[PDB]
């Protein structure tokens, strides 16, 4: 049973670059970087799908 990708998603190609390590709050965290908009989202949650 192949669960089809939901209605509205942004398909990003995985790179060895878009995941960067930067400071957020008081600690060091692994951060995503959205290719089309160029953003942070340091939290493991709250990142755009």
């Amino acid at each position: 049973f192949v669960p089809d990708v939901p209605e509205g998603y942004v398909a990003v190609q995985y790179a060895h670059r878009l995941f960067s390590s930067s400071l957020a709050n008081k600690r060091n965290r692994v951060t995503y970087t959205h290719p089309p908009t160029g953003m942070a989202y340091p939290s493991p949650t709250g990142r755009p799908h």
């Binding site: 390590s21 930067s22 400071l23 060091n28």
Partner: protein
């Protein structure tokens, strides 16, 4: 070990003594809220060459928030080039054009 500021002025001309220099780019920085400690540190003998010629690259760690950590050297573009040998010639680089 360290040279004395008197043995560097009244020693035989032929002698070869070695010094010791510091690097400190990966030095641990102070904390946030802290009572400051007293005292400061001196440098009396500097070079004028400049030294450090055999230095391929440096500081292999990525910075807390910014990209390049200040004085950081990347590998030379020639330490990574295999050129085919000629029949008489032996080692030559790539065409580049």
């Amino acid at each position: 070990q360290h040279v004395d500021a008197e043995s560097i002025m009244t020693a035989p001309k032929g002698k070869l003594f070695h010094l010791q220099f510091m690097d400190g780019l990966l030095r641990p920085e102070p904390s946030a809220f802290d009572p400051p400690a007293s005292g400061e540190d001196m440098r009396l003998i500097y070079p004028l060459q400049p030294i450090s010629v055999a230095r391929s690259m440096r500081a292999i760690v990525n910075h807390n928030e910014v990209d390049r950590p200040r004085g950081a050297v990347a590998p030379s573009s020639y330490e990574m080039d295999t050129g085919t040998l000629s029949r008489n010639g032996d080692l030559l680089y790539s065409p580049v054009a």
